[PDB]
Structure formats: C-alpha cells, structure tokens
C-alpha cells in the first residue's frame, strides 16, 4: 500500500518514528504485509482543512483490491482516524482521508511491471 | 474540494495567507461551501514546468461532480489562472492544473465514509 | 508528462540539476517533447518504503496515452530505474513507480482546457 500524509504541523511537532508506526498500523488495518507498506510524511506545509488553518492532516491511501468499496473504506477510516488523532493530538474534524484503488499494471517495481 | 499546490517559489516568496484566500476563491469558483474546501501548499520544491526551472506552480483540484467535463474545467481554469498568476506574480505559461473527479466512497471523514 | 518524485534524502544529498536531467530523460523515455515535460522533486521527507526507512524514492508518472498498459509501463520502468538508481545512488529495491493515465479534459493550460 502507499500512504501519503500532508500536515501543517512543523516537523518538530510530528512524533519521531511516526512513519514506522504508521507502516505497522497500515499492515494490520489493510491486511497487507509490512514489507509491501510505503509511507510518505510531508510536514511543515501551509494548509487549510474545512476552511480553517488550524493544525490538520490529509492522508491518501492507495492499494490493490482493499480500498474500492464504501464498506471496506468505512472500516479502514475508523482505525486510521483512531491512530492519527492520538499520534498527532488532533481532533477527528482535523483529518481527512482519500482512498484510491490501484491495479498491478500501474506499479513499477525492480525495473519492470509484474502484472501476473 | 481538495486543492494541492506545488511550487519552486521559496516559502518567503509565497504571499502570507495564500492558503486562506485560495480557500475562499475555490468555494466561489467550484460552487462548494468554504467549510468543505481543503488547500495544501508545498513551497520550496525543485521543479521544471514545460522543460524550464523558472518559477512555476502546479495545482491539482479534486471534487465530486463539478470537475468531470471539459466545459466545467474550462470555466474553472480561467478563474484559477487569474487568481494564481496575480497572487504569485507568474505568467500564464508557468502554471498547470490537473482535475480529478472523486466519488463519496473515496472520502474518509470523522472516522467513517458517508456514501449516502 | 507530469513526474513527481518524493524522497527522504535531504536536499543536499540530491544531485544539483536532477529536475532538469529527469526532464530530458523523461522526454526520451516517454516519447514526448521536453517542452511538455513537468518534474516536481520533494526532498527531506520522512519515508518508509517496503517497511524500511533507509534512503528511498517514490516516482509518480502521469501522461496521455503512453502509460496505460503493462507492456508500455514495463519498458518505461526499466529506463527510469536505471536513471534514478545511478543519480540517487539507490538500489533497485529502494524505488517504486506509479503510473497514471490522464485525458485532455483534465489539464488546465493557459486559462482553458484544450480537449481537441
Ligand atoms: O501482487 C501484485 O500483483 C503486485 C505487483 C507489484 C506490486 C504490488 C504491491 C501492491 C501493494 C498494494 O496492493 O497495496 N503495495 C505494494 C506492492 C509492492 O509489492 O510493492 C503487488
Ligand atoms: O456530500 C457528500 O457525499 C460528501 C461526503 C463526504 C465528503 C464530502 C466532501 C466533498 C467535497 C467535494 O465534493 O469537493 N469536498 C469535501 C467534502 C467533505 O465534506 O469534507 C461530501
Ligand atoms: O495535446 C493535447 O491534447 C494536450 C492538451 C493539453 C495538455 C497536453 C499535455 C500533455 C502531456 C502528456 O500527455 O503527458 N503533458 C503535457 C501537456 C501540456 O501541453 O502541458 C496535451
């Protein structure tokens, strides 16, 4: 899976090791092995969420097969909100998630595409 | 709506408050309430636009229903170019926009997905 | 084409001029003119790739017509991996690419959309 987190929290207000802990949480929540989990954290950005520049975060989650229905994404959302609200000290109104299904022909890995 | 702006202008050459003013402009242009507008500004990046590393900006706009046709996006583009060229002091050849339709099952909000 | 590169290498470990050289390489690999090539490099991020926080990079490539099949993307992947592994001094296991087809109605250029 690919997780991208944008936040207006400065880097020194993002807890050390968040990218590693988010990697472990995402493996458990999405049901994918941790060695296939990718996390990108981009802190110190200028952001408005729901019209407000108060501290906030945006998460994007892309994966094959497991983020393509409302029922699957409702379950994932509950767990990712629980993890991020407590790690970043943010209220549930200061985070939004976007889910993007991917297919195997879109992923370049070790110099090829493995669309088995 | 979700707006993401990447620029190679350093943070101290991006006008203070741009994220707030872009939030208000996007509400008016896209016809969505300001409390549903999200803006992310990522300055100080290394960028080439149209093969040139001169100052530039890339905007991505994602929304339900209103960015899915050429006719709708032509109208939005005129207004967003007018706003960004004047705020960032950039020529119209130094900005590009990408439009991405979203559906309600892709948005995680307050720990769930509200696909009514 | 639009290329976005995220890396946890600090800016001072990314070779000067990478965005310009990636622009020239992408024109040759994708078969598009260099004056239509866009590159965004975002260094100094916190990242885990395949569960590891060792140096890594993520590349996203978006274009009309030429990134929409496994056969086309397999060819592109070989060349982009060769270029990035050697420029960034990274092993082939520390880079991943995602490919995204675009259509002409999604691109705002000079204040309009040119969907001919
Ligand atoms: O099993 C596959 O078809 C395959 C091929 C290339 C990449 C991946 C893959 C998929 C996911 C995902 O579904 O979230 N995440 C990471 C990878 C990867 O192996 O790097 C899966
Ligand atoms: O009304 C909906 O179905 C719904 C459900 C969850 C989120 C949103 C929403 C939509 C947009 C958009 O169309 O640009 N932007 C923001 C939101 C949101 O409420 O946060 C809309
Ligand atoms: O020829 C087109 O239809 C057209 C219209 C507007 C933009 C572009 C374009 C396409 C690509 C791509 O296919 O990778 N990249 C850049 C552009 C652009 O001209 O800026 C192409």
């Amino acid at each position: 899976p690919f997780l991208e987190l944008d936040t207006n929290l400065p880097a020194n207000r993002v807890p050390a090791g968040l990218e590693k802990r988010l990697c472990a949480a995402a493996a458990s929540i999405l049901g994918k092995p941790a060695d296939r989990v990718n996390v990108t954290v981009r802190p110190g950005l200028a952001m408005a969420l729901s019209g407000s520049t108060e501290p906030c975060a945006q998460l994007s989650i892309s994966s094959i097969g497991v983020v393509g229905t409302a029922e699957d994404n409702r379950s994932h959302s509950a767990h990712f909100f629980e993890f991020l609200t407590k790690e970043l000290a943010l209220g549930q109104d200061r985070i939004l998630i976007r889910f993007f299904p991917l297919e195997s022909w879109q992923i370049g890995k070790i110099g090829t595409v493995m669309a088995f």
Side-chain angles (χ1 to χ4, degrees), chain A residues 81-103:
Chain A
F81 267 83
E82 197 60 31
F83 178 82
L84 286 178
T85 54
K86 298 302 182 151
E87 280 275 4
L88 299 179
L90 289 177
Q92 67 168 10
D93 63 310
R94 299 312 297 156
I95 296 170
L96 288 166
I97 307 180
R98 282 167 291 164
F99 294 92
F100 302 99
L102 285 175
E103 294 183 335

PDB file of all heavy atoms in Angstrom, chain A residues 81-103:
ATOM      1  N   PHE A  81      -8.292   6.904  11.696  1.00  0.00           N
ATOM      2  CA  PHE A  81      -8.626   8.113  12.495  1.00  0.00           C
ATOM      3  C   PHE A  81      -8.191   7.915  13.954  1.00  0.00           C
ATOM      4  O   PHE A  81      -7.637   8.804  14.520  1.00  0.00           O
ATOM      5  CB  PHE A  81     -10.128   8.415  12.421  1.00  0.00           C
ATOM      6  CG  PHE A  81     -10.490   9.380  11.316  1.00  0.00           C
ATOM      7  CD1 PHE A  81     -10.663   8.936  10.014  1.00  0.00           C
ATOM      8  CD2 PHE A  81     -10.626  10.736  11.569  1.00  0.00           C
ATOM      9  CE1 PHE A  81     -10.987   9.820   8.996  1.00  0.00           C
ATOM     10  CE2 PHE A  81     -10.945  11.620  10.547  1.00  0.00           C
ATOM     11  CZ  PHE A  81     -11.127  11.160   9.264  1.00  0.00           C
ATOM     12  N   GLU A  82      -8.432   6.715  14.484  1.00  0.00           N
ATOM     13  CA  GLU A  82      -8.051   6.434  15.891  1.00  0.00           C
ATOM     14  C   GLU A  82      -6.540   6.589  16.044  1.00  0.00           C
ATOM     15  O   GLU A  82      -6.100   7.218  16.995  1.00  0.00           O
ATOM     16  CB  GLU A  82      -8.486   5.023  16.259  1.00  0.00           C
ATOM     17  CG  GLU A  82      -8.511   4.811  17.764  1.00  0.00           C
ATOM     18  CD  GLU A  82      -9.443   5.734  18.534  1.00  0.00           C
ATOM     19  OE1 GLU A  82     -10.484   6.130  17.980  1.00  0.00           O
ATOM     20  OE2 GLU A  82      -9.122   6.066  19.679  1.00  0.00           O
ATOM     21  N   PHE A  83      -5.786   6.048  15.099  1.00  0.00           N
ATOM     22  CA  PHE A  83      -4.308   6.095  15.174  1.00  0.00           C
ATOM     23  C   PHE A  83      -3.802   7.527  15.026  1.00  0.00           C
ATOM     24  O   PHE A  83      -3.059   7.976  15.869  1.00  0.00           O
ATOM     25  CB  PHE A  83      -3.739   5.187  14.079  1.00  0.00           C
ATOM     26  CG  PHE A  83      -2.234   5.189  14.029  1.00  0.00           C
ATOM     27  CD1 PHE A  83      -1.501   4.399  14.896  1.00  0.00           C
ATOM     28  CD2 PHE A  83      -1.553   6.012  13.149  1.00  0.00           C
ATOM     29  CE1 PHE A  83      -0.117   4.412  14.864  1.00  0.00           C
ATOM     30  CE2 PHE A  83      -0.169   6.020  13.114  1.00  0.00           C
ATOM     31  CZ  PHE A  83       0.544   5.222  13.975  1.00  0.00           C
ATOM     32  N   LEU A  84      -4.291   8.236  14.011  1.00  0.00           N
ATOM     33  CA  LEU A  84      -3.723   9.582  13.713  1.00  0.00           C
ATOM     34  C   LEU A  84      -4.161  10.660  14.708  1.00  0.00           C
ATOM     35  O   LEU A  84      -3.353  11.513  15.008  1.00  0.00           O
ATOM     36  CB  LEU A  84      -4.138   9.981  12.291  1.00  0.00           C
ATOM     37  CG  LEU A  84      -3.388   9.250  11.176  1.00  0.00           C
ATOM     38  CD1 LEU A  84      -3.891   9.680   9.807  1.00  0.00           C
ATOM     39  CD2 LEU A  84      -1.884   9.465  11.284  1.00  0.00           C
ATOM     40  N   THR A  85      -5.410  10.592  15.167  1.00  0.00           N
ATOM     41  CA  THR A  85      -5.864  11.611  16.145  1.00  0.00           C
ATOM     42  C   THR A  85      -4.969  11.555  17.394  1.00  0.00           C
ATOM     43  O   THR A  85      -4.599  12.576  17.897  1.00  0.00           O
ATOM     44  CB  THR A  85      -7.348  11.454  16.508  1.00  0.00           C
ATOM     45  OG1 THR A  85      -7.596  10.116  16.943  1.00  0.00           O
ATOM     46  CG2 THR A  85      -8.276  11.814  15.367  1.00  0.00           C
ATOM     47  N   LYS A  86      -4.661  10.340  17.847  1.00  0.00           N
ATOM     48  CA  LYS A  86      -3.876  10.177  19.105  1.00  0.00           C
ATOM     49  C   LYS A  86      -2.371  10.439  18.904  1.00  0.00           C
ATOM     50  O   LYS A  86      -1.782  11.067  19.735  1.00  0.00           O
ATOM     51  CB  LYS A  86      -4.166   8.775  19.666  1.00  0.00           C
ATOM     52  CG  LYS A  86      -5.617   8.525  20.049  1.00  0.00           C
ATOM     53  CD  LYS A  86      -6.115   9.505  21.073  1.00  0.00           C
ATOM     54  CE  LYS A  86      -7.538   9.221  21.498  1.00  0.00           C
ATOM     55  NZ  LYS A  86      -7.782   9.658  22.891  1.00  0.00           N
ATOM     56  N   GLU A  87      -1.817  10.005  17.777  1.00  0.00           N
ATOM     57  CA  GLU A  87      -0.381  10.273  17.490  1.00  0.00           C
ATOM     58  C   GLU A  87      -0.130  11.774  17.282  1.00  0.00           C
ATOM     59  O   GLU A  87       0.850  12.263  17.804  1.00  0.00           O
ATOM     60  CB  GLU A  87       0.044   9.535  16.214  1.00  0.00           C
ATOM     61  CG  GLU A  87       0.340   8.058  16.409  1.00  0.00           C
ATOM     62  CD  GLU A  87       1.748   7.726  16.876  1.00  0.00           C
ATOM     63  OE1 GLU A  87       2.520   8.651  17.140  1.00  0.00           O
ATOM     64  OE2 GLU A  87       2.052   6.538  16.980  1.00  0.00           O
ATOM     65  N   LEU A  88      -1.026  12.461  16.565  1.00  0.00           N
ATOM     66  CA  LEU A  88      -0.778  13.891  16.187  1.00  0.00           C
ATOM     67  C   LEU A  88      -1.458  14.863  17.154  1.00  0.00           C
ATOM     68  O   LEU A  88      -1.258  16.063  16.977  1.00  0.00           O
ATOM     69  CB  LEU A  88      -1.273  14.112  14.750  1.00  0.00           C
ATOM     70  CG  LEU A  88      -0.577  13.260  13.692  1.00  0.00           C
ATOM     71  CD1 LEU A  88      -1.163  13.535  12.318  1.00  0.00           C
ATOM     72  CD2 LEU A  88       0.919  13.521  13.691  1.00  0.00           C
ATOM     73  N   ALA A  89      -2.250  14.353  18.093  1.00  0.00           N
ATOM     74  CA  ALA A  89      -3.023  15.204  19.038  1.00  0.00           C
ATOM     75  C   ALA A  89      -3.959  16.121  18.254  1.00  0.00           C
ATOM     76  O   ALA A  89      -3.967  17.311  18.509  1.00  0.00           O
ATOM     77  CB  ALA A  89      -2.100  15.960  19.977  1.00  0.00           C
ATOM     78  N   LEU A  90      -4.738  15.528  17.359  1.00  0.00           N
ATOM     79  CA  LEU A  90      -5.686  16.293  16.520  1.00  0.00           C
ATOM     80  C   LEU A  90      -7.091  15.759  16.763  1.00  0.00           C
ATOM     81  O   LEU A  90      -7.232  14.569  16.977  1.00  0.00           O
ATOM     82  CB  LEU A  90      -5.330  16.099  15.042  1.00  0.00           C
ATOM     83  CG  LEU A  90      -4.059  16.785  14.550  1.00  0.00           C
ATOM     84  CD1 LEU A  90      -3.799  16.432  13.093  1.00  0.00           C
ATOM     85  CD2 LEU A  90      -4.147  18.293  14.728  1.00  0.00           C
ATOM     86  N   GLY A  91      -8.081  16.628  16.672  1.00  0.00           N
ATOM     87  CA  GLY A  91      -9.481  16.184  16.750  1.00  0.00           C
ATOM     88  C   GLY A  91      -9.895  15.482  15.470  1.00  0.00           C
ATOM     89  O   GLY A  91      -9.245  15.681  14.437  1.00  0.00           O
ATOM     90  N   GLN A  92     -10.983  14.728  15.523  1.00  0.00           N
ATOM     91  CA  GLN A  92     -11.406  13.943  14.333  1.00  0.00           C
ATOM     92  C   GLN A  92     -11.866  14.855  13.184  1.00  0.00           C
ATOM     93  O   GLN A  92     -11.896  14.394  12.065  1.00  0.00           O
ATOM     94  CB  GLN A  92     -12.494  12.947  14.738  1.00  0.00           C
ATOM     95  CG  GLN A  92     -13.802  13.589  15.164  1.00  0.00           C
ATOM     96  CD  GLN A  92     -14.889  12.546  15.256  1.00  0.00           C
ATOM     97  OE1 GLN A  92     -14.633  11.349  15.180  1.00  0.00           O
ATOM     98  NE2 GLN A  92     -16.119  13.001  15.414  1.00  0.00           N
ATOM     99  N   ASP A  93     -12.189  16.106  13.482  1.00  0.00           N
ATOM    100  CA  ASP A  93     -12.587  17.093  12.439  1.00  0.00           C
ATOM    101  C   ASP A  93     -11.368  17.697  11.706  1.00  0.00           C
ATOM    102  O   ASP A  93     -11.573  18.488  10.816  1.00  0.00           O
ATOM    103  CB  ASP A  93     -13.421  18.211  13.082  1.00  0.00           C
ATOM    104  CG  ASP A  93     -12.638  19.011  14.105  1.00  0.00           C
ATOM    105  OD1 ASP A  93     -12.013  18.397  14.972  1.00  0.00           O
ATOM    106  OD2 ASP A  93     -12.669  20.245  14.028  1.00  0.00           O
ATOM    107  N   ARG A  94     -10.154  17.335  12.104  1.00  0.00           N
ATOM    108  CA  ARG A  94      -8.932  17.958  11.512  1.00  0.00           C
ATOM    109  C   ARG A  94      -8.167  16.957  10.637  1.00  0.00           C
ATOM    110  O   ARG A  94      -7.039  17.238  10.293  1.00  0.00           O
ATOM    111  CB  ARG A  94      -8.041  18.472  12.640  1.00  0.00           C
ATOM    112  CG  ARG A  94      -8.705  19.540  13.502  1.00  0.00           C
ATOM    113  CD  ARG A  94      -9.367  20.657  12.708  1.00  0.00           C
ATOM    114  NE  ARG A  94      -8.411  21.422  11.919  1.00  0.00           N
ATOM    115  CZ  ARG A  94      -8.724  22.116  10.837  1.00  0.00           C
ATOM    116  NH1 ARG A  94      -9.974  22.146  10.410  1.00  0.00           N
ATOM    117  NH2 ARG A  94      -7.789  22.782  10.189  1.00  0.00           N
ATOM    118  N   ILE A  95      -8.806  15.857  10.301  1.00  0.00           N
ATOM    119  CA  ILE A  95      -8.172  14.852   9.415  1.00  0.00           C
ATOM    120  C   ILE A  95      -9.162  14.455   8.341  1.00  0.00           C
ATOM    121  O   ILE A  95     -10.351  14.348   8.629  1.00  0.00           O
ATOM    122  CB  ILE A  95      -7.761  13.614  10.243  1.00  0.00           C
ATOM    123  CG1 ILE A  95      -6.688  13.955  11.278  1.00  0.00           C
ATOM    124  CG2 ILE A  95      -7.327  12.466   9.338  1.00  0.00           C
ATOM    125  CD1 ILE A  95      -6.440  12.842  12.271  1.00  0.00           C
ATOM    126  N   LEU A  96      -8.667  14.288   7.122  1.00  0.00           N
ATOM    127  CA  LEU A  96      -9.500  13.696   6.045  1.00  0.00           C
ATOM    128  C   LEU A  96      -8.653  12.636   5.335  1.00  0.00           C
ATOM    129  O   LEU A  96      -7.435  12.785   5.260  1.00  0.00           O
ATOM    130  CB  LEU A  96      -9.949  14.759   5.040  1.00  0.00           C
ATOM    131  CG  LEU A  96     -11.008  15.731   5.566  1.00  0.00           C
ATOM    132  CD1 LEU A  96     -11.139  16.932   4.642  1.00  0.00           C
ATOM    133  CD2 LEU A  96     -12.354  15.035   5.725  1.00  0.00           C
ATOM    134  N   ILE A  97      -9.323  11.632   4.830  1.00  0.00           N
ATOM    135  CA  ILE A  97      -8.617  10.557   4.078  1.00  0.00           C
ATOM    136  C   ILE A  97      -9.209  10.445   2.680  1.00  0.00           C
ATOM    137  O   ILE A  97     -10.396  10.629   2.526  1.00  0.00           O
ATOM    138  CB  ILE A  97      -8.762   9.204   4.808  1.00  0.00           C
ATOM    139  CG1 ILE A  97      -8.318   9.301   6.270  1.00  0.00           C
ATOM    140  CG2 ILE A  97      -8.012   8.111   4.055  1.00  0.00           C
ATOM    141  CD1 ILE A  97      -8.442   8.002   7.034  1.00  0.00           C
ATOM    142  N   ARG A  98      -8.355  10.163   1.706  1.00  0.00           N
ATOM    143  CA  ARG A  98      -8.844   9.846   0.345  1.00  0.00           C
ATOM    144  C   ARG A  98      -8.323   8.449   0.028  1.00  0.00           C
ATOM    145  O   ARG A  98      -7.171   8.168   0.356  1.00  0.00           O
ATOM    146  CB  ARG A  98      -8.397  10.869  -0.706  1.00  0.00           C
ATOM    147  CG  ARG A  98      -9.219  12.150  -0.674  1.00  0.00           C
ATOM    148  CD  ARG A  98      -8.573  13.254  -1.492  1.00  0.00           C
ATOM    149  NE  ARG A  98      -7.356  13.690  -0.837  1.00  0.00           N
ATOM    150  CZ  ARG A  98      -6.394  14.402  -1.406  1.00  0.00           C
ATOM    151  NH1 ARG A  98      -6.498  14.761  -2.673  1.00  0.00           N
ATOM    152  NH2 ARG A  98      -5.329  14.737  -0.704  1.00  0.00           N
ATOM    153  N   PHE A  99      -9.158   7.651  -0.592  1.00  0.00           N
ATOM    154  CA  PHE A  99      -8.805   6.260  -0.947  1.00  0.00           C
ATOM    155  C   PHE A  99      -8.759   6.134  -2.464  1.00  0.00           C
ATOM    156  O   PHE A  99      -9.675   6.546  -3.143  1.00  0.00           O
ATOM    157  CB  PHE A  99      -9.850   5.280  -0.408  1.00  0.00           C
ATOM    158  CG  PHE A  99      -9.925   5.200   1.100  1.00  0.00           C
ATOM    159  CD1 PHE A  99     -10.797   6.004   1.816  1.00  0.00           C
ATOM    160  CD2 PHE A  99      -9.116   4.324   1.805  1.00  0.00           C
ATOM    161  CE1 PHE A  99     -10.864   5.925   3.198  1.00  0.00           C
ATOM    162  CE2 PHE A  99      -9.186   4.247   3.187  1.00  0.00           C
ATOM    163  CZ  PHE A  99     -10.064   5.042   3.881  1.00  0.00           C
ATOM    164  N   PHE A 100      -7.701   5.481  -2.936  1.00  0.00           N
ATOM    165  CA  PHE A 100      -7.505   5.314  -4.396  1.00  0.00           C
ATOM    166  C   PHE A 100      -7.143   3.877  -4.744  1.00  0.00           C
ATOM    167  O   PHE A 100      -6.067   3.413  -4.414  1.00  0.00           O
ATOM    168  CB  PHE A 100      -6.366   6.217  -4.879  1.00  0.00           C
ATOM    169  CG  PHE A 100      -6.585   7.680  -4.603  1.00  0.00           C
ATOM    170  CD1 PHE A 100      -5.980   8.283  -3.516  1.00  0.00           C
ATOM    171  CD2 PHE A 100      -7.408   8.440  -5.414  1.00  0.00           C
ATOM    172  CE1 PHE A 100      -6.184   9.626  -3.249  1.00  0.00           C
ATOM    173  CE2 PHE A 100      -7.608   9.785  -5.149  1.00  0.00           C
ATOM    174  CZ  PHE A 100      -6.998  10.372  -4.067  1.00  0.00           C
ATOM    175  N   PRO A 101      -8.040   3.140  -5.409  1.00  0.00           N
ATOM    176  CA  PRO A 101      -7.675   1.828  -5.904  1.00  0.00           C
ATOM    177  C   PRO A 101      -6.577   1.889  -6.977  1.00  0.00           C
ATOM    178  O   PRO A 101      -6.541   2.802  -7.746  1.00  0.00           O
ATOM    179  CB  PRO A 101      -8.972   1.296  -6.539  1.00  0.00           C
ATOM    180  CG  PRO A 101     -10.057   2.054  -5.812  1.00  0.00           C
ATOM    181  CD  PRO A 101      -9.467   3.438  -5.648  1.00  0.00           C
ATOM    182  N   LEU A 102      -5.702   0.902  -6.930  1.00  0.00           N
ATOM    183  CA  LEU A 102      -4.636   0.772  -7.952  1.00  0.00           C
ATOM    184  C   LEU A 102      -4.756  -0.605  -8.593  1.00  0.00           C
ATOM    185  O   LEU A 102      -5.344  -1.494  -7.995  1.00  0.00           O
ATOM    186  CB  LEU A 102      -3.277   0.824  -7.253  1.00  0.00           C
ATOM    187  CG  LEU A 102      -2.785   2.175  -6.749  1.00  0.00           C
ATOM    188  CD1 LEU A 102      -1.481   1.986  -5.992  1.00  0.00           C
ATOM    189  CD2 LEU A 102      -2.587   3.149  -7.902  1.00  0.00           C
ATOM    190  N   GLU A 103      -4.180  -0.748  -9.773  1.00  0.00           N
ATOM    191  CA  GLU A 103      -4.108  -2.071 -10.431  1.00  0.00           C
ATOM    192  C   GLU A 103      -2.625  -2.397 -10.635  1.00  0.00           C
ATOM    193  O   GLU A 103      -1.811  -1.490 -10.674  1.00  0.00           O
ATOM    194  CB  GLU A 103      -4.911  -2.042 -11.718  1.00  0.00           C
ATOM    195  CG  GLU A 103      -6.389  -1.864 -11.431  1.00  0.00           C
ATOM    196  CD  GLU A 103      -7.343  -1.873 -12.607  1.00  0.00           C
ATOM    197  OE1 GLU A 103      -6.920  -1.561 -13.718  1.00  0.00           O
ATOM    198  OE2 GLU A 103      -8.523  -2.182 -12.390  1.00  0.00           O
TER     199      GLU A 103
END
